[PDB]
Every structure is written in structure tokens, then in C-alpha cells.
Amino acid sequence: MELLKHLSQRQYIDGEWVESANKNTRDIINPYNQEVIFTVSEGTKEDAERAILAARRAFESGEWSQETAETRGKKVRAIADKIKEHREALARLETLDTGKTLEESYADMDDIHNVFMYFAGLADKDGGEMIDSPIPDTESKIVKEPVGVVTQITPWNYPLLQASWKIAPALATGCSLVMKPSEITPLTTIRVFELMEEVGFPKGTINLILGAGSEVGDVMSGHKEVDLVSFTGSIETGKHIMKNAANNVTNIALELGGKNPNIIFDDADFELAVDQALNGGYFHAGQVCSAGSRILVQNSIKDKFEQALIDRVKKIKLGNGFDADTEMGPVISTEHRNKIESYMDVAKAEGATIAVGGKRPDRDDLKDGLFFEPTVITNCDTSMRIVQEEVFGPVVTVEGFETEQEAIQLANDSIYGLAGAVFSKDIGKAQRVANKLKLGTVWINDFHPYFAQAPWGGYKQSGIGRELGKEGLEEYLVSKHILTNTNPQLVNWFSK
Amino acid sequence: NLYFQGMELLKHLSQRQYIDGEWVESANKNTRDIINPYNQEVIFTVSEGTKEDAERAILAARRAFESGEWSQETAETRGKKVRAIADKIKEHREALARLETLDTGKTLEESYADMDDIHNVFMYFAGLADKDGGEMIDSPIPDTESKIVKEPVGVVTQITPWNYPLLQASWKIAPALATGCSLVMKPSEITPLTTIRVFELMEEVGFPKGTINLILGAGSEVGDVMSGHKEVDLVSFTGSIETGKHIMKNAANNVTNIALELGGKNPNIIFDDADFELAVDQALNGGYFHAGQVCSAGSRILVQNSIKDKFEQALIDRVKKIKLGNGFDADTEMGPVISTEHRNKIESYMDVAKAEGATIAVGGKRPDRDDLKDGLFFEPTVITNCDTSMRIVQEEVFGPVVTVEGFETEQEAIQLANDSIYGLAGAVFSKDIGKAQRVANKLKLGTVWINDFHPYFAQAPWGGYKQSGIGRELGKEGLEEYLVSKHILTNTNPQLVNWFSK
Amino acid sequence: MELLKHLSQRQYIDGEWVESANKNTRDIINPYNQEVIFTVSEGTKEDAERAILAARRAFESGEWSQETAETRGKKVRAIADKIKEHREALARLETLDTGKTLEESYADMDDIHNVFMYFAGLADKDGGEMIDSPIPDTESKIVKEPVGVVTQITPWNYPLLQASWKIAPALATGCSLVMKPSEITPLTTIRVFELMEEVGFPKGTINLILGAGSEVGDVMSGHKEVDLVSFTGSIETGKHIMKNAANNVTNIALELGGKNPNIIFDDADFELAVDQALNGGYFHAGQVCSAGSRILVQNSIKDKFEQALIDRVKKIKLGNGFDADTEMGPVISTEHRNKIESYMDVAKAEGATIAVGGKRPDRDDLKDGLFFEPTVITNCDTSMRIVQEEVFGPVVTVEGFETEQEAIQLANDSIYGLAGAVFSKDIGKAQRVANKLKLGTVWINDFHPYFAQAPWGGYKQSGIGRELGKEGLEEYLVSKHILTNTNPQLVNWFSK
Amino acid sequence: MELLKHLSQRQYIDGEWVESANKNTRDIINPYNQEVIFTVSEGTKEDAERAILAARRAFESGEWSQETAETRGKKVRAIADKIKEHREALARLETLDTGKTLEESYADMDDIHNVFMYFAGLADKDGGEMIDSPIPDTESKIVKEPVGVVTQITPWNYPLLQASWKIAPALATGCSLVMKPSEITPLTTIRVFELMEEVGFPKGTINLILGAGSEVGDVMSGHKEVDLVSFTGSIETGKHIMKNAANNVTNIALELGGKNPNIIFDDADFELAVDQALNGGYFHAGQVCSAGSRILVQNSIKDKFEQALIDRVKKIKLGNGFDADTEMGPVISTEHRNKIESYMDVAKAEGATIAVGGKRPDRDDLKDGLFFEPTVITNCDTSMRIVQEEVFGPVVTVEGFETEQEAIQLANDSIYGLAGAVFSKDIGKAQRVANKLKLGTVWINDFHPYFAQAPWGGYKQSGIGRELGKEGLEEYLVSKHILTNTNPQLVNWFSK
Ligand SMILES: NC(=O)c1ccc[n+]([C@@H]2O[C@H](COP(=O)([O-])OP(=O)(O)OC[C@H]3O[C@@H](n4cnc5c(N)ncnc54)[C@H](O)[C@@H]3O)[C@@H](O)[C@H]2O)c1
């Protein structure tokens, strides 16, 4: 609440904080109590176009695109320092907006700092290659250039984190960007723009559009001047975006959902598996793309595991993200909670069992909030929708498997392939499994970790491209082969 | 004679599709007649596959990929197989070149050069197969091991054009096999000859059942299965912009990656301080090799005003002497265009140009000469008095046609050259190399040639900026379209987090 | 014997097969029976100089150094094909010259083929980099060039194998080379030069000097025109070479000996450990740089292990390398056998036990040959010379250890660091150990494997630089930074 | 000024500032006036050993070597920030100690900052590779580890700059180091150690020895526990160091002298060439390893060029490095000035001409200082010592050439190959030349620039290895190939 007293309420376009073209606004809600906490501009599609054209003009002027990579790196480092300096405030702002615990928000800010720092350090390390030309008397080189104008669209679950993954490499490479956060959670994204403005970037290099994807999204994906669309969100929106981007053969980087398996063998450290099954399923109320919603447990320990998990789920402390006792916060919106509730009806209807949870909590201090009980669904199989689809709530399904081959089959039996885990003390076995899983990230005896040093993204329908790591940077670069003939000779193919 | 020998080849050439290790007919036994553009005679009849055939191939590729017979084979061994394919190309170099000239109509010498490139393309990728399996990352988390493993992407569909059939096919096949993917290829319905032949050769080398598949058919009938089937992990397409957009939209249904190699409106920038005769020679080469039916064609000539009049005159005079004829005759400098339909598009573009106010300085019609009457020939053409706002300048005609525009300054040449939706390739001619470098840096093109025109090679990536494409072919980047990264993170000292209560 | 009827007996200098400058010769001996089997030229130091000057002239002419990398790659591939084509004959020639089994020689030829093929494929893959310059209006690039003239010196144990590791990358990069094999084993090296000549290389690009290192070695290491000395041999010779190479600040790549540990935990697959302890200690009669001469076995199974090993050592079949029943051949020379024998006296004198072997075999069919029984030395410790020094014979020492830390400490307690192994079914433990071992190569549950795809070399005193892999190629390249100022301006630091 | 009042006077060993073991000291002299300005400890060989053993102990404890690369990077960044924070004081300290102008010292500090920043950013970017193993059922990976204990020896010309090139990558990779600056110029090196201590590194990770290479140098190059010797200095000292390092097969990185050509064609921008010839020859009174001491000018403009250069040399303002008017300071020592003077006698005796300078300046305010006039030597040829040898003073030679081929031949006609330049408006020609020059760095239309992003080092006798760039980091890393057999099988080569 104090934090918002000086926070900007507007969009940032072509170096100026401006309102929506039609002065329209939107109320931002705190999911803990559903109170309106802040009011921001609700931009129009013309605002998005104007931002894009400004990014284009700025890119062509070359003030940022022709700046030395070393200097661009120092600026990105400066942004990183700002994140660390305002770490406390940013974490509170994110907990206020998304509802997750304050400790989870602090960890985000540490990651974000590191994300910017990583890309700041990578900026001046690889400018292309020299090729040994197969043509005598020619020089061949590949220069890597910033792709140009980039649109960046993020989700509401980890707003600033997902924003950092896009902004950092865009600025490091010299691109101009136009970013639009989830309409429902713009707070930390607004704040980071204020911070980037303080660091100082050329007019038009960075732009912030605030609005609903349904209104402004198509301009951002289908405008002719966009060279790349980087999107993190749901599969249906990503498909739509890709179809639209095709109108101008615009490259896309998509970071979509997952149906991430958490494979638990009987030779796994049992208490560790239970601990990590809870972590995997319920951090941020399961509103995490890396969530371990699909638990695969070996039959010999399935019954014992289900019991232990259920018993633990019954003790999970729900509450306000600002209270240190809180272990799980509310879900993001009314709409989202409704989808979760409909999924419970779907599960019962297909023949599955709600072993625990599956409803709103009764407790007094939670009535006003968008809470939903941590849930465990049993007696289910791969043919069911509750197992195949991304619920994105505090819900997990438990399936049994007999053999190592069967666990692999089940784990890969989904349209997705973002991330997953394998728990077993037999490391050789965990490696065999990891190798056969069609997942962008595989954890052996762990669950959730990602970091700037390594690429993150999907196999199959969890995405296209990668974020983080050197590959994350490559989404923002384009190669140019400049071939110079040092002893040009007439070919005389067409008779003189 | 050389014609005769090319035609003899057809009597042993397969007429069918290659699916799941078997040469088979179309599911409905339908067929198609292949035509030689030099005389329009039917020269061969092949199967015309159905969409079900394409699905069956895709499912076979999937089954083969999952069995691991190729995907789990050692990279070194995969490299040897790809090298074996390369050796086949060289061994059958003569026959393949004649087959390509017969099918596409381009000169035999141009076809020989293709076969040399193709050999080298396979050889390059054969050598690259076992060189980079991923990375070891220094993890920021103590007591963890972090590594990135690069795996073959899976099932890949490959679609090619009629201009340089085997060349474009090699750019896709080589890295696919080198990385361990399974593939389903469909060449242009109009030119399947060399693609069929290369499959016979790949079969001789020996690959596991389903690893390679050849579908023969029209993109309008089987294309959507190849781009929109759930089991496809990557669609690699080389063709026109409209088809590519359609493909990308369809591939989106399953969030399927795409690599697109589309057209271009490639500038050939000529400064007054360029070696004049060299610029004229390369303007002709740029515009008329393969009758301008080349994606790297220099259709848009930008010449500095001080030498524009002198240049136009020299170019026109040279265009009047270009020898047209049969690709098999050594005297032939330019062959026919590929089809009736395509020649008609070119003819309509001449009407478009006159209607916008441009001038057909020379050519712009079918040649009269007797020995060319039966063929799909079209005269090499030069269009003058035109500007960037015109369709004849902005759009890819893909025929033996070039436009000439003047420019005063270096900045103006860059602006005109970048004033198109495309960005595949281009050239700069000037003896002032520093200037050519400044220009090259500002051109939004995947490939820029300084004092040259046309060269590409396996060692370096080829592809577009802007609407000329997505992704790259050739070079290490060409191989990366066929790989997918996996981050395997191992916690070597796992500890409970105890976030959730007791 | 028939193989030698057409084999050249001369040196190859500046495109010509020539005799020694003083017509001196040397008799080559078959260690199986000590019979003279061939006579070759014994070159003079002036021959070595002439070769070096020819390599220099050839390098400067640019016929090979300026040839396209792609074409160079095809030539190296052609050499590879020759190896495969003459595989049978080469293997027999190596068994005749070195005395190792024919099967071991066949495996060498397969490796060699692959070594050339690997480097043939690597030739045109990396010509340098484009750097993002921190100075505005400048272009910065790094071009990688062949280093120039290279001298290559090899040992008698695996003559052609060690030669291939040097020749392949030298030719692939465009260098000129002068090679000198061990004076006692020149057969396969001569043959490969005949084969390289058939392929065709420009005059002076390749040169073969035949002679004793004590006579011609110093020219090869200390001549001003040499840019790199690549040496594979013993530590003392390497030190001498490095000292001499210093006279002209000449780069060196050294591949020296080792005291390679073979660590066996009690949770190792017991029979596998015994099998690999034998393999590690007795392939090629222990005359291998990767030999597992130092066995470290966990105390709990030490007694059982020693007994099993000893019993197996007593059944090792000695004989002629050409007989299929032969499991271990003779040692290379009288001199070398004598060193091994004196090491037995050294061991007894320090208080160690010759548990088995330690002498020449009695059997009739072995009397004439340079045989020495496979040996096991027990009751020894790290302070002993028999444990610290490279015997390079069919001999192994057995030391016990209690803990994982103690095994690491003992394994690292030597001046060397070439290779080693860890045997345990607990893979996590084997990884912890592997990470702490100061060895260029570590095998987990295996012993001996190397391959072109990966670099091989030492930590500590086992060497300087690497052979094989991309790093192997880098020993033959030198970087040049070409910086172009595209907008040169006077600095005017000094008064006008 | 007051800068020295708080500056430490001692060595830094094993986390403690300590005196020499024998309490011996040394007086530091300001070359501007030859006054003693500071007194520091003069360490013994035992001190150097103790530092080395402390570095070893620290490396094995793993407090720094096992720290995450990301964290190591942050520390190196912290050092970089210290340099920028104390830039003023450091620059004055370097001008006081070395005598060069204050502006030159400020530029150094900017470079140094950037050197540390670059390596800070490179620290966590490449930990090794995954190899596609040719052996089925095996995993192959290459891990890059810090090499271990490193000794670093620097010259007196650019003390802190040369130190930064070694310290930055050493710390970034996780090595322990023992540094010894030139005995005559320890001021900035002492200061940077105080700064590194403030940042905080584990006990023994960094050590500073102060001495005389003739007394402590051999311990630093020949001690068994050293894994790498990084040396920047003269060729004779480097050779000595290499020979000594050989005793323990210790890797060496040598950055030695040069006889750098400055090639000037008749189609060069004339005034630019004259300006850069002066810069190349007289910055820091020619006491720079990248000095353009050997001018090669095309005959058609040779006479005109010599006249213009001479006229400009006559106006060079000599004086105190602290005075803004000063363009060139004094030379470092009496001994060094004497060497320069004897080289003038050598030049006259071989038949060359001292066209201008070649003596001490007469002006009053320079009488007390170690000044020497900027000099130009004409009518000389490649056979002369004045042309072949590194004088390392404010001296340049001028040679004529007719053709492009002749310029290349003359430029490469020396034992060295560190750096050089080509001046011509015909860029294509400058590229042809640059390609043929055997130099680690080639400047086209510029002279002197180096930067962290690109490797610097020599061809031929100018050195071994590289500093700066990724290659600079690689001198501090060693590769380990860990091969795991995932399906181990008995080989059964030996009888059961
Ligand atoms: N590190 C590895 O990759 C590797 C591989 C195989 C063998 N090796 C080692 O090599 C050794 C093989 O034994 P060796 O007896 O052949 O070694 P050696 O040092 O006695 O002989 C090696 C080579 O050096 C030559 N030589 C002798 N004096 C020389 C001199 N003064 N200057 C230059 N060259 C001179 C010899 O003629 C011979 O060609 C063993 O120590 C073994 O461990 C190492």
C-alpha cells in the first residue's frame, strides 16, 4: 500500500509516461482480499502501434543498436544493480500483485538480479565467426546483429521474472523493445521501467504498453515492423500469436505451458520425494509453468506415498503472502479459480477421486480471498483430461507405474514437454530416464530450479525457442554472411 | 547425344514413393506426367501420392525415431553414413546433372556445379555430426551438476522447390540425418527426378526402416498433412512467401517449429567507382542464371546516377547477345523457364510493368527463333524508368528479368536496397572496399557479397532477414534447426526444503 | 616378413625418398625372437635441418597453408581411407615391430582411421571470430592460422597411433611437418608416409626423419624455424626438449608418462574390477601410457582382490603376437627389459613383495624373446619408488585405502596426472571422486578408452597441452587479431 | 604526494601484510628527478616459497576453487569497481612510479577497470562440453577446471595494466596466485592488493611478493607446486624462465618483446601516418611492448615522410608526467637509459644515421631526470642490430620499401611477432598485408589499441600463449575428460 504512493500509473512510450489514447483505465486487484489497490492506464491498439513505430525509429537511428556491446553490457548491469537496490520493495510489490509469499518474491528478485547480470556479462563475448572459405581469394565472415524491434508479452504468475528473461537479452544485443505485461499484474513491470528510465536509454529503445491482450495483442504480434515476438503464456494464446505473426513471416519465441512429470521410484529417498512432490505441486498455489502437477510413483510404494502426501497436504498453511506463517497464497483471479473449480467437476466426471482438497477453504480469514485448497487427485489414468491438461492450480494427479519403461511412456504421454524430475538413489537409472524424457529441463533428485546460465524452454508443444543461457540471447540475434571476393574476375558466362 | 544419355537414365529410375523402407505407388494408384521444359514433351510418369500416404510416412518416421536405430546410433557413425551419401553423389555426378538439366531445363554446366555443391554439402555435415554434443555449465547452485545435451529434434518434414531440386533437398537431408532425425521429404510435384534418384542412393547406403521417406505429390493435396500433423517436430520449407505463410499458420496448430527459406528482391548495388565490366558481367550473372529462377537472383539493380546511362546501354547490348537453347547444348547460356503457368506469370508481369509506367528496354516476350518455338522460353529482359513504388520492383518475378533504378548517394542506395519486404541476399560493387563494408553493414540481408554475386557454401549459414525467412540452412546454424536442447540438472546432495509444515 | 619386401628403407625429405647423408644404417629387431628383420637409414642432424628448412620453404610458398580448409579436409580423409584399405598389412607390421598382439594392432588401425577422419571433418569448421569492439568505428576479428613448421616425435609403444594424433591435425590446419618415430620402431611410420605420398601433398609439406633422438633430436627441438614441437615420450626427454625449445621460445606440446590409479571400491562389480585391473596393467605388457599400474583397492576387499588378481595373473598366456592364443607379448627391448628387472630389485629393497612374476619366463618357446612375466607387487606404500615411478612394464602395485578421501589423496600422490579409473556401483560416489582426481582423463567403471572426439593429455607432470579433440587441433593454430579503424582520426598528442 | 602516506610497504602473504624474512628493504625512485620516494620490503626466496605453499593449501581447501563461477565473477566485478573508485589515486601513483604522463595513466585505469569487468562477465559462461561418444553406452564430458597455483611476474612499464591481465582471469577461474611486480615499480601493485583484500578473498588465494627476479624469480618459476607461470617481460628472462619451468613440466604463458613494424604506403593518409608514427614510437618514451619502433615507408614518399617526422620530433615537449603540457616523460632507470645510449653508439658504428635526438636533453628542468630525447634513425637496413633488437626507448628506425611484397618481407624479418600496423587508404591492400604479417595483433590504419575482448600475444619469439579475450582465460583452465561406461561388461581378454 505505501509502495504504490509514488508508483507510476501510466504507459511508457517513446521516452514519455503517457495515458491511454482514450484515457481508459483499469483497476488492479489484490487476490488476498479482492480489494482494488491501484488504477492504471488501459492502452489502445494505436498506442501499441505508436510504441512499435518508435522502437523502429530508435533502432534505425542506431543510438542503442550501434552502441558498443561492452557499453550495452554496463547498462544492463546497471539495471541489475537497481533490482538489488530495490529488492525489498520489488518483492513486496510482486507479493501484493500476485499473492505469493514474500519469501518466494525475494527469491525471484535474487534470480532477476542474476538474470540481468548474466546477460550484461554475455553482451560482448560473441560477435560472430570467421569462416575458412572454400572459395580461394575470398573472405567469409558471419556477423551477428540485433534482430531489430521486439515485442515481449508476459504472464501474471511471475511478472517481473518472465519480463527479465526477455528484457535482458534484448537490451544486451541492442534491440528495441515493446513490452506488455499481463493486464492483471502490471505493478513490478511498471516499476522496472521506472528503474530502466533512471539508468538511461535512448528515446524509443524501451516501451511499456499496458492493456488487455485481446485488444492490443494482435498489433504486437502482427505488425509489419516487428522482427521478433517473444511470448510466455498459455498454449492457445501462443498458437494464435504464431498464426498472426505469420502474416509478416515474423520470428516467434514461445514459452508455453506444461504437464510436468515428477517421477518417483521406490528406491528414491522417500521423505525427500514427498517434500519435493509438495514443493513441485504447490509453490505459488501451483501457478508455475514448471509445476509438478503429474506425479508418477512406482507401484511398490504408491499406497504409502499417497498417504504421506495427503497427510502433508492437510497441514499446508494458507493465508496472506505477507504473513511469515503462510505457506501457500491465493490463486490469481476469480476467473482462474473458476477454471480450477470446473476442473474438479471434470475429474469426478471422468471417474477420478478428489482424495483431499478440491474446494475453497472455509476458514474466516480466507473468505474474502481467492483461495483454493491444495488438492490431490487419485485413481486416474493418462486418457483423462485432468491428467492431460494444464490446470495451473494447487492440484496434482497421482499415477502408478511398474517399470522404468512404463514411467517414461507415461511421462511422455502428453502434448507438452517443458520440465520434469526423476527421484531415485540409483543415479545411473535416473540418467537413463532423463535421457529418454522429451523435456527441455530435467531434474534428477530436485524440483524447480532454473538459472540464467542454462537455457529453458520446451520440447513438443511447450514452446518454440529458448530463454536464458546463450540460446536465450540467440533469439535476439540474426546472422549475416558477408562474403568479400578479394580478387574479382569476370566469369564471362554470357558471351561478350 | 548428351540428351540421349540423360533420357536413358530414366529407363532405370524408380517411379514411386519411398515409404517405410519400400518403394510404393500412390494409395489411389494416381499418377503424374513430368515435362521437359525445353520441348514440353512428357518424359516420365510417377506416382501422385495421397494425404494418407503422407500420414503413413510421418507415422513411420515417428516409429523409426522412437525405436532409436538411427537417433541412438553414434554421431561418428551417422557421420560416416552421410559421407557415404556424399560419395554416391560424386560417383553418379554425371547422371544426376543430366537428370537435373532434363527436369529443370538449366544448362548442364550449371547442373554439374550443383552436384559439386551437393557433394560438399553432405561432406560438410558428415564432418560436423560428432563435433558438438552440448555443454557443461558451471552451476550457480552448489552441489549440482548442470549439462545441456543436444538431441535430434525428432520427425522432420522437408518441402522443396522446383528450381534447384536436389540442391535444396541436400540442405535439409544432410543435417537431418547427421543429427539422427527421421525425415519425410516431398519435392516439387513438377520436378521429382533427382530427388527420386538420391533416395535410391540413400537406400543403397542403408538406413533403418522409416528413417527416410519420400512422398511425391502436389502441395495443395498433401502439403497440409506435412505441416500440420501432430507427430512432426519441425517443418523445413523452401519456397514462396505465400506458401510459407500458409505453412506457418498450419504448423501453429501443434506449435511445430518451422524453418522457412522464402523469396527475395535482392539488390545488386553498383557504384560509379566499381570495376565497370565486372559489374556488367555480374549484373547479367545475377539476373539470368537459370533464367532468373534463383532465390539469390539479382533482380533489382541499383546503379549510381553518374554511370546509370552508360551501364544501361552496356547491359542491354549484352542481353541482346544471350544465347538461348537446350540445356544439353554446350553453346546454351540460358535455358527455358520451368512451366506454362510460370511463363504466364512472367508475361503478366510485363503487362503490369508497362501499366505502372515502366519501360521494357529489351526482351519482355517469347523468342521467335524456330528451335525455341516448342519450348517454354522467355527472353532475358531489362526494365527501366521504374521506382520503388512499383509492383515490378517490389515483387519477386522469378524470371529472366531485372529492373534498373538510379541512386545519387551511398545512403540512398541503402534505403532503396532495404525498401522491400524481403532480405535474403545482395551485392555491392565498388573498388572502395571501405565503402562496400559500410554498405554491407547496413543492408538487412542474410548474405551480402562484396564484389561478387551468387556464392553460398556449406560452411556458412544462408537465410533471410525480414520476410525472406525464418531460421537458417547450411553452416552450424543449419544443423541447429535439427537439434533441441535439454538441460539435465542433477542435485548431488539433495536436502529437504521443509517449506510445507508438519 | 613378406610385408617388408616392398617397404621403403629410407627417409622422406622434401618429396624424395633418400638415404642418410652419411649412408649410415640401423637394424630393426623383432622383440619376439630378437632377430634382425629390416634395415633402415640412420639420418644425421644435417638431414633433420634440411627437412626443417624444406618444411619452412613449403609453408611459406603457401601450396598447403593457403589451400582451402575444405580441400585440406578431403586429403586428410583420403589418408584415412588408405589406413582402412591397408589395415591388415599395417596391423601385422605394427605387431612385428612392437610385439603386441595382432588383435590389439587391428584395434589401433581402427582408431587411426577414425583419428584421421575426425580431423578431416574438423578442418573447415572454425576459422576464428568476429569481436564486438569496445572502440567505436572499428572492426575486430580474430583469424586462426596454421602455426607453421611443426616437429613431431613419437615413442615405440604405439608408433602409428601416436603419429596419427600429430599428423592429422597438422595437415588439417595447413602446417608443414617433420616427423621422427622411435629409432627402434619405424616400420608403420614409413608405411604411412608411402601412403601419404600416394595421396599427394606439396613438396616439403611432410617429412620423415629416421634416427636416434640422441643424435637428431636436438635439431628438431631447437631449430629456430620450428614453431611447435609436439612430443610424446618419457618425462626426462620431455624436460630436455622443453629446455632446448626455449632457445627460440618455441611452443611445446608434451605427452608424457603416468602413474595412473585404478581405484576399486568394495561396492564395485568385483569380477569387472579384476578383469579391468588385468586389462589396465597388462595390455601391451604394460607398455602403455594409460596403464593402470597403481591399483588402489578398498581395505574391506583388499585381501580377496589380491588373491583373485594373482590367480588370474598366473594364467596369462604369453607368446607371439601373431598367434591367436597369445594374451600378452614381449617387452620392446633388452634395455627396457633390464630397467624392468632393476625395478624388481628396487621394490624388494624398499620392503615390497613380489607376490607373483617379477622375472623372465622359463618356457622354451619364450627363451629367445624379450619376455617378462606379468607381475603383482604387494605390501607397498606411497613413499616407495616402485609406486611413484613409471615402470612401463607388465607390473602393477596394490595399495589399500579405508575411505573415499584417502583413495583420492593416494591417487593424487604422484608427480603425474595423465589418466585413471574409479570402480563402484555407486555412480554418485564415482563422480565425486572423478571430480577430485587431477587427471586429464578419468574413467568411471572402465579402463583405457580414448577417442578422437575428446582431448587427451596431462595434468601436472604428465604433459603440456592436449592431443585429440578440438584442443588437439588448437595446438596447431595461432590467433591473429586484425583491428581495422574505419574512421581514422589524428590523435594530436604531440605538438605541431 | 600524500598518496604514499598510507600505502603499505610490505608483502602480502597468506592473508597477512609481512616484511621480508630477513627484514631487507629497497628504495623506490621517481625517474623524473631520481629522488627516493618510498621504501618497501625486499623479499627472500623463502618468502616466495611460503606464498606458493599458501596458494597451494588455499587452492586444495577449495574455498575459492569450489566457489560458484557466478560468485567468483561478482568478486572480480567488485575489484573492477575499486579500480574505478580509486582511479585518480591509482593513476597518480602509476605516473609517480613509471614517469609516464598522467593522461596515459588515466587511460590505463579505464582499461584495467574494463579488463576486470570483462573477465568478471566471462567467469560463468563456459564450463566444458558434452561429447557425442563413439562408444555406445558411454557418457563423455569435458570439464574445465582451474589449473591450480599460478605465479605471475610483471614488468615495470605498465605495472598495474600487466598485472590486471593476469589477476583477473586467475581469480575468475578459481586459481590461487602469487604475484611479483617489477622490483623497481611496486606501488600500484601494492595498492591493488590492498583493494583486493578489502573485497575479501580466502586466506592464501592471493599473494604479493616484492623482490628482484634475480633473487626470488627462480622459486616462482621452478617450484614443484606451481601449475602455471605467467610472465610478461624481456625475451632473455622468458627463456630463462621457460628452461626453469621445465624442471617440473610447468606450463608457461610468455608475453615478451617486439620489433613492431609500422608500415606506411604512399597512398596512406599522410598526416595520419605521421601522427601515428609519433604515437607508435614515443608514447611512454617508447617503453611499450606494442611500440612502433620499426617504420617501413614506401620509397615514393620516404624523403617527404622522414622530413615531416623529424620536424615533429623536434617539437615534442618533455617534462614531468604531472604537468599537463608534458607529451613525453623520462625513461625508467639509469641502467635503462645507459642501454639506450649504448644503442646509439651501436647504430653509428654499423653505419646508420642519428637524424635527430640520440642524446640526453640539455634543458635545465630535465637535468636531474632520466630523460632521453626522442630519436629517429635513418639510412639503416635489416642486417643491423639497431633494427633487429628491441631498444625499448624513444627511438624509431626508418626503412624504405618499393613494393607490397618487400614491405611484408622486411616486416617479418625479425625474431619477433607481437604487433604491427598498416597504413593505406586502399583497405583491400591493407587486408592482404595484414594476412601475411606474422603478428599477434595487426592494426589497419591505427596504432596501439588492445582490449579485453580480444587476445593479445605473440607469434614467433614474442611469446607463448595469449592474454586477454577468451584465450586469456584458457591459460588458467585445464581440461578433464570424464568418461562413464553405463553398461560395463567384462572384456575377458585374459584367461579365467
Ligand atoms: N602422454 C601420452 O599420451 C603418452 C602416450 C603413449 C606413451 N607415452 C609415454 O612415452 C614414453 C614411451 O617411451 P619412449 O622410451 O619411446 O620415450 P623416450 O623419451 O625414450 O623416447 C621418445 C622419443 O624421443 C626421442 N628422443 C630421444 N632423445 C631425444 C632428444 N634429446 N630430443 C628429442 N627427441 C629425443 C626418441 O628417439 C623417441 O622418438 C613412456 O614414458 C610413455 O608413458 C605417453
Residue numbers in the entry:
A (entry chain F), C (entry chain D), D (entry chain G): 1 to 496
B (entry chain A): -5 to 496
Lines from the paper:
BADHs are a group of enzymes from the aldehyde dehydrogenase (ALDH) superfamily that primarily catalyze the oxidation of betaine aldehyde (BA) to betaine; some BADHs also utilize other substrates. The solution data are supported by the structural analysis and emphasize the importance of the NAD+-driven structural rearrangements at the cofactor-binding and substrate-binding sites for enzymatic activity.
The mutation also reduced the substrate inhibition. To fully understand the kinetic and inhibition mechanisms of G234S-SaBADH, we determined its crystal structures in apo and holo forms and in the presence/absence of BME and compared them with the wild-type structures. In NAD–G234S-SaBADHBME(−), the dinucleotide is in the ‘hydride-transfer’ position, in which the amide group of NMN displaces the γ-carboxyl group of the catalytic base Glu255 towards its single ‘intermediate’ conformation. The lack of a serine residue at position 234, which stabilizes the ‘hydride-transfer’ position of NAD+ in NAD–G234S-SaBADHBME(−), may also account for the observed flexibility of NAD+ in NAD–SaBADHBME(−). When the NAD–G234S-SaBADHBME(−) and NAD–SaBADHBME(−) structures were superimposed, the NAD+ ‘hydride-transfer’ conformer of the former structure fitted the aforementioned uncertain electron density of the latter structure. Thus, BME oxidation of Cys289 and the G234S mutation helped to trap the ‘hydrolysis’ and ‘hydride-transfer’ positions of the cofactor, respectively, allowing analysis of these binding modes in SaBADH.
